[PDB]
Amino acid sequence: DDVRQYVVRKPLNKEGKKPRTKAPKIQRLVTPRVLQHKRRRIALKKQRTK
RNA sequence: UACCUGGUUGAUCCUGCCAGUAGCAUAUGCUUGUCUCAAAGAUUAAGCCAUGCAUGUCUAAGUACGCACGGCCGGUACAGUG
Ligand SMILES: [Mg+2]
Ligand SMILES: [Mg+2]
Ligand SMILES: [Mg+2]
Ligand SMILES: [Mg+2]
Ligand SMILES: [Mg+2]
Ligand SMILES: [Mg+2]
Ligand SMILES: [Mg+2]
Ligand SMILES: [Mg+2]
Numbered sequence A: 001d002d003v004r005q006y007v008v009r010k011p012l013n014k015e016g017k018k019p020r021t022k023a024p025k026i027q028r029l030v031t032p033r034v035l036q037h038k039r040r041r042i043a044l045k046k047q048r049t050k
Numbered sequence B: 001u002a003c004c005u006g007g008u009u010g011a012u013c014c015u016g017c018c019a020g021u022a023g024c025a026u027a028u029g030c031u032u033g034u035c036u037c038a039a040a041g042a043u044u045a046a047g048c049c050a051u052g053c054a055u056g057u058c059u060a061a062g063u064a065c066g067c068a069c070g071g072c073c074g075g076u077a078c079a080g081u082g
Helices: A032-048
Strands: A010-012 A020-022
Touching: none
Parallel strands: none
Antiparallel strands: A010 A020
8 A cells, every 4th residue: 555645735725825735754664765775885885795 | 761860967088767769559639632442349248139132043854724825626645935
């Protein structure tokens, strides 16, 4: 299942402003950036060993 | 600038101090037109204090669902300032 689908959003409607919906930033979410950081951490060990 | 002068005797030569002389640094008195520097509650009380200020800090890079502001899609995690 996808977590990004099930985020609880907050409606937000102030007088004189258009209606809006806000959702929080997901934390501890596996993203390509996390995998690439781990990949480079692994790749530095190879350089040290060589 | 390696310097002296008055005072003891009726007069003299001494010893010897007192007083005189010139800096310096604290106070005080009188006086004071222009410019450049410039010390300044140490001495008596490391005595006592009204009031105000004298220590705070964010980058692309720890944590933003404050519309507090803000552009588009509109479930389509999180635009940005903060
Ligand atoms: Mg995280
Ligand atoms: Mg005489
Ligand atoms: Mg003298
Ligand atoms: Mg003039
Ligand atoms: Mg004092
Ligand atoms: Mg004192
Ligand atoms: Mg002082
Ligand atoms: Mg101070």
